[PDB]
A paper describes a structure:
For our structural studies, we used a variant of CcScsC in which the second residue Cys2 is mutated to Ser (CcScsC C2S). One possible explanation for this is that CcScsC wt may form a disulfide bond between the N-terminal cysteines at the high concentration required for crystallization (above 100 mg ml−1, well above physiological levels) and this may interfere with the crystallization process. Replacing Cys2 with Ser in the C2S variant does not affect the disulfide isomerase activity or trimerization of the protein. The crystal structure of CcScsC, solved to a resolution of 2.63 Å, confirms that the protein is trimeric and that the trimer is formed through the interaction of the N-terminal regions of three protomers. The α-helix joins the globular domain of the protein at Tyr52. The globular domain of the CcScsC C2S protomer is a typical thioredoxin fold with two catalytic cysteines (positions 81 and 84; pink sticks in Fig. 6) in close proximity to a cis-Pro motif (Thr191–cis-Pro192). In the unit cell, six protomers are organized by crystallographic symmetry into two trimers. Each trimer is formed from the interaction of the N-terminal α-helical regions of three protomers. While we captured a single conformation of CcScsC C2S in the crystal structure, the comparison between the scattering profiles predicted from the crystal structure and the experimental SAXS data provides strong evidence that the protein trimer can sample multiple conformational states in solution.
Numbering used by the authors:
A (entry chain A), B (entry chain A), C (entry chain A): 2 to 223
Amino acid sequence: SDQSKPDKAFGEKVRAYLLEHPEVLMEASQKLQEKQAAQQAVSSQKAIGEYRQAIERDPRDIVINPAGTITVTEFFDYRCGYCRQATPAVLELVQKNPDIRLVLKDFVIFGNDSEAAARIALGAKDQGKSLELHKALMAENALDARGALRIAERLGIDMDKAKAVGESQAITQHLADTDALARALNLSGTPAFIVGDTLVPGADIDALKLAIEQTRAARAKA
Amino acid sequence: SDQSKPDKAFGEKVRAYLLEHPEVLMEASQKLQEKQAAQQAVSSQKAIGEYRQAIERDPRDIVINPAGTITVTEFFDYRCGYCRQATPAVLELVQKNPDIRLVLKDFVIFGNDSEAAARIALGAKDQGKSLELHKALMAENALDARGALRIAERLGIDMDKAKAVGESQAITQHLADTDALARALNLSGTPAFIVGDTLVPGADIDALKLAIEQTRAARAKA
Amino acid sequence: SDQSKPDKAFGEKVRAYLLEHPEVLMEASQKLQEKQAAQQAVSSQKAIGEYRQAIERDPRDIVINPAGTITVTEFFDYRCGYCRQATPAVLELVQKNPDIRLVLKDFVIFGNDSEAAARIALGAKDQGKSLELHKALMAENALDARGALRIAERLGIDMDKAKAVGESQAITQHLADTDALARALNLSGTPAFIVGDTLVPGADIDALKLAIEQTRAARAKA
């Protein structure tokens, strides 16, 4: 060709169709949304793999069943209702599958009370009562800072030493770095589970069970 | 046919038109919005008909001119400015058209003050001073709970008995069930008028007048 | 023609293309956004020209280097961080280009503290210390009403007379009319610069420098 040649009749027919069947635009918008979601999924799993050393293998982290082969990281806040309602199931899942390694990240999204519960937990970490304290703190309906201390006291934790480690600048740096890790993983809130490349946003227990099964099978393929 | 045959030239012409006349997408989006609005209108009128027994014929409700053939239900809050500015016109409309039956639903959307005005009105319901108390409460600019009591006192209402009925668990259940009815009718706020199948959202006096005329004519067709 | 003749095959091909290349809709949406932005730009510059007498030539306004040919109007709030960070550069720009006439509009968007700083500045206007007071008020990190008075006192301003003029009903009308002018210019916040027909929304120093150059060149074309 050597000439741009307009075709008004073709355009009129295009407009007529679109106006008479505008649902085509909804369908195309849905295609684009599925495209955008797949892009986000790829970015999330690439980030999970980039920071896996920090997500799954941080010495400062509280780890339930450190023998586990499959590492499930949980970002949580001790006063988030979704975290509290998912906690019993998470602990039952570690209870029934010993090959699970549960990394507990303290992702404080609320105020001083939640920060206080996290610091107590991290201070008592090395006294070997993390499973019980985690379950008990999550069990209190309206967990205060005073309540958190009373719960940790009622479990025989060395309170003087747990409080000393909790407020230390090391625990402060630990929590700050965890907040940074959540930001790098583009997390939106709590709970947020990370198993394999998968990210489970929220208290979606069934999805987390499925992801653990997938990772067990995939890692078993060797 | 036996073969899917691509046509890149047709698609290029489609893209060219859309990019050169993207207003077609606005026009199609407008068509879809009109479709969605008509769907919502149908759902609203079907719901109004489903719960008509509760909307128009609840013995606990305050009813102005119970003789009326045409039932106009109003969901209102005594401290909503739109309700207060529409009230004089609503009462003039019942004043000039005796065949109107005005059901007064107390749809408390604000705090304790509004709840207090509603309870006083429902407590004094059976003392035969509802029109006057409704108009006077709506007339006070900054209606407090103290103010509402002073208004009801200045109208000769038996205050000891009106206060006794107001706080009763019956009035509490009445208000709770009304809040539920508004939720089932997908109401967004106050005022909200319901005449025939029509729902008038807000202080749209002209639309309400028109809807009463339509229902009078339709019910007169027998 | 004498007949509307449907063409289902043409419409199916349109739908197929759109679903297989829905990015065409994003591209068309971008075209429409560029169209809407150009419309807004035209409306803004037409409004700037309509109210130029008020923007650039209001006797009550504080004006730095009133000799300047090029009038740059700034809407600002003494406690807006963007205004405080842009202020040093604005003053350096007047410092290096004498032909600039800087009109200072007090666009109070915050509470009493900002209103107090503006009233002090407008009260001291006629004592010939506006450049210094403007720079000093903008220099205080957490400017209070008490702080603003201490800054104006530390600059030798006649405090009794500056305070008398500040609270006067004239200064109140001045600020109210400025708030009205910003509303007529559809301003969204502070800072907001106006030079020639151009409106620079925010602390976009480079754009403001460019706009001053353009206006200098255009007005020099005679």
